[PDB]
């Protein structure tokens, strides 16, 4: 059988589109392409085994093709079919990779909407990064409020303690010192700790709202991504026709 | 102004204190006790000296200022309050910890909260490296300390290249020795004509004889310094070997050296002492015995951020990788609805348990399924995460685990990301995943090296030699066929004679086997060492074995010199991220280098500190930074000032970014001047060394010269007067552009590669003049770039037809300077055309290209170092102006002999790059996980093989490059 019409033969020196085609495909999927060493007569073969693209060189001598000397096959197609029927022993060859106005308009529309989705994805990513930075700074501020609340808390505990005892009744030195200054001082202290705890609580609520916004942004980005990959693949495979 | 500080006395009564914003801590303490004297229960209070202050910073941490003279702004306390308690810690320890925390950017106590045992073992055990480096620093003080603080900036090549040898007359260099030894500075000059091979002591003796105005015959009491900067000649090397002397030889400049006394330098250098920090104090079965398969239980995922309606089902991708090689096929769990991510499934792998290599890395991913677009459902990872299947102490991970999942890297569509970091996401709002690993009724660990040695010796021509030689010379990214791999593995015992084959033979071995890897381990054990330019490749994604990287590191230890180490430092810092544990041999090598050479230490610190804002390596680089700052010596204070300065700058630009976005140029400039005039800004921005070059000091700012550009970026121009007395000899003013909003790691890579291109061209025998000017990135979109003197863009020169640039060069070089100016322009143009083609830099309009008055030409900004576009692509086509300048204004620019020699130099440069393309491949492959959008996905690095045509022979590449040039200009 003649070459240049078989499924496995793809042609030019792309070199890396083989990796894309063979990635995330079933074991035994294969491709044959002539490139990377010389203009014609190289004919390397990429076979997917163990998740890896094994490379096998097809030696050519005296009009004969074959993996290793001596070469017993006539054409590339004969070798491919012979090793499709029989194993390489290490897995036999299994899966070969295979009007004008309408297709042109479809390709143009796909390019336009791919650009739309790319810009939307970029905007979503920048919003994600900004929200992440806001979340981190808000968490740091929450921890700072926690530490300030704690320090004010043992300050308040020490105050009451000493006060309550040192200054209890007229029998002590504080005949009217408590009422004069110290009860108001403790009043200001509890007002301050209440203000700080209220600030901590409201900032935790704001952090929860920001985390919900972060979750929503992540959901939107993660839903819009695979559609973007699918559209990129479709645009690429229509551009590969370029006719 | 008063800020109404709330002071917390030991009794507990709050004190409303009023103090100036610029106030010393001790003054505030004294005022606080003075006010508390009015407060009740003053008799309970103890003496002022006993107590100490406590405050909470904006970094959500508390600090007790043992000895702080800082202002209130410098305290950066979160809330205006000041607790008073009895101190319990150590003064020196706490102040050192505060300094280290300000240098790193995060407090040292956070590393103490981290309970991960590998972190604590790293912190305790890297202090041996720190202490050994410090002890080495003090072996021959003050000479050793002089080497540490001021290291010789010498080339690795003592033998001079023949072209600059011909530049010298008989190999005689004329140097102006300046001596200022006098009651007052009078700048005594002695002109010397000495051979370039003389050691510094001979220069000292002959300059002494010159100063004796006769020939006296001081002895061991004198050293040399570069005029205008803090560079010194202390090591017995050829005078030419120092980079200053070679630069003066090559550029035809007059070298000026001050003669100074040893004692002044010795007094200039304080003692370096290191003290142990506080944290310096605090059944097994062989893996080969276990006979079972790898099998991991995926229990559940807490939650995933994927829509229920938009996406039907999710699953988990898995793998068993070793570098980038899947040791076996990937496994999946049955698809479940997004509402209930519960699998509870024992996924099983083809890999046999003893067949596990020491560097296995069981990657994961949570991925989506969508069949709406087509029958073949599209799969995209919702999130990813890696797990090392071995512990830092060689034990296979058991029990249950919980992994937080990182987001997918931008532009990476592969479901798994085995390039990423091996650990949980520190954020806990991220999607988590519970797993569980097989239990073998005991702790199972990788076998020791001796058992691997014992396994071998039991588990295990001309055409062959020619094929081996052909393989050894092949590109590292060259594709290897299975026949080649079997041939390489068969003749390994003969591959050992060819030591350049190790990066290839390594990819020949199947890491799946337990029999092959023992033999490979014995081979690496007896492998003859190779050159550091080839053993650097063995430190990348693809070579993760402990023995491989141990061999590579010991080869760099034997053969890498500090000249190249400062050049390949960015690559090694980025290759740190590819290591598996925290305490490895590469980190010890880099640390011991940075703790014996302040040139290495300064840039080590700044690279890590730049990469501290990425959460994936923030913890590793923070532990490394704290170790360095423990043992960096006296430089840390200087670093702080630099950091302080940088912070101020960033803050200013932040106010420029949002507050000054919509105002015009004049009002932004006046607000900038107002911000400058603040005394704290002046204190922070002056009197510190430079981040771009530690040897050049920045002095008093020039507010008139400092100005904000009118370009779209709006960066800042900052001008510093040189503190050195010899300000005229080197340069009056140090000018730097501060950019806040542009990524400048790509620019660093481009300029570095330009530097190696220039070096290889000079070494070959070609004089192509490059400008690898200094660039530094210290954060995220934050960078410092140097200023080049007397340079103007092509747009500026042309504005001030086709002959404008040549007319300007004629006006600026009329006379005998015409021919030399034209020659330098041609050589610079040849070098930059070759470089911009090979690296495929972006579109270069007039603004991207500048020409000095001398004749040199250079490119300023970059950002496409491998043609970030889809995918050949000659960006820099020779404009008709360029041709006119090349051929001295002749209309028939193509039909001149100058054009013929221009093309011939371009061809020789292209070949020169092509023989060393292996180095460019390795240096580009070290920058994969850097996060730069341009340099992931080897499809990007294959551009440097397309433009260098590595698969073909040199003649096909010659024809390809000739065709590329012929298309480009197309007659102008």
Numbering used by the authors:
A (entry chain B): 326 to 414, 421 to 429, 441 to 585
B (entry chain A): 18 to 234, 246 to 310, 323 to 500, 524 to 863, 873 to 943, 950 to 1050
Question: What does the paper behind this entry write?
Answer:
Of special interest is PI3K alpha (PI3Kα), a heterodimer of p110α and p85α. Cancer-specific mutations in p110α, such as H1047R, result in constitutive PI3Kα signaling, contributing to tumorigenesis by sustaining aberrant AKT-mTOR pathway. For example, the small-molecule activator UCL-TRO-1938 (referred to as 1938 hereafter) selectively enhances PI3Kα activity, demonstrating cardioprotection against ischemia-reperfusion injury and promoting nerve regeneration in preclinical models. Here, we present cryo-electron microscopy (cryo-EM) structures of wild-type (WT) PI3Kα in complex with the activator 1938, the unliganded PI3Kα H1047R mutant, and the PI3Kα H1047R mutant in complex with 1938 at resolutions of 3.17 Å, 3.09 Å, and 2.94 Å, respectively.
